[PDB]
């Protein structure tokens, strides 16, 4: 499963209308990994389903150890098109008229699994399309052993979400 000293990344974007569990891959820099189909959940998805999704998204997270792999993964035109494509889908699927509508109440929770620990970080919604760890104190992280039940992971995600800051 998860390898020693290997980082696995997932981010959850939550609006009042949906919950999106997203595998991020990379190395230092990470990005939504377009290999994997999205994992969109109902905003009120139960803890266990959410936990299972998060663990699976984490399992898909790749460490781009190959240089050319990294360079290709983060190609600016490709990154730009993927993100734009990302926005388009969400807007179309949930009927957001503008990007702002999509983003204005979007929370982001970062999930990081390395070694024995899952770290769930609330974020500060600093600009419409930016979430920062600034102004989130380390103490607000939800830390869970990696072997937590899917339900505890789901519950822990909900806890972190409650700690996101915005506006």
């Amino acid at each position: 499963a998860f390898n020693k000293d290997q980082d696995y990344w997932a981010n959850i974007f939550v609006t009042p209308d949906f919950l999106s569990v997203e595998t991020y891959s990379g190395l230092g820099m990470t990005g939504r990994d377009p290999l994997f189909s999205p994992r969109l959940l109902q905003p009120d998805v139960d803890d266990k389903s959410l936990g299972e999704e998060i663990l699976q998204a984490l399992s898909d997270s790749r460490t781009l150890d190959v240089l050319e792999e990294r360079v290709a993964f983060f190609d600016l035109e490709k990154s730009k098109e993927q993100y734009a494509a990302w926005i388009a889908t969400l807007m179309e699927k949930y009927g957001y008229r503008t990007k702002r509508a999509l983003f204005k109440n979007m929370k982001k929770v970062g999930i990081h699994l390395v070694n024995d620990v899952i770290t769930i970080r609330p974020s500060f919604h600093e600009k419409l399309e930016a979430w920062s760890g600034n102004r989130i104190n380390e103490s607000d992280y939800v830390v869970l052993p990696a072997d937590s039940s899917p339900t505890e992971i789901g519950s822990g995600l909900r806890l972190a979400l409650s700690r996101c800051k915005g506006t």
Partner: peptide
């Protein structure tokens, strides 16, 4: 790669 920053389908870790 630390406080994280998430922007445009990317995150600085």
């Amino acid at each position: 790669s630390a406080k994280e920053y998430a922007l445009s389908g990317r995150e600085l870790t």
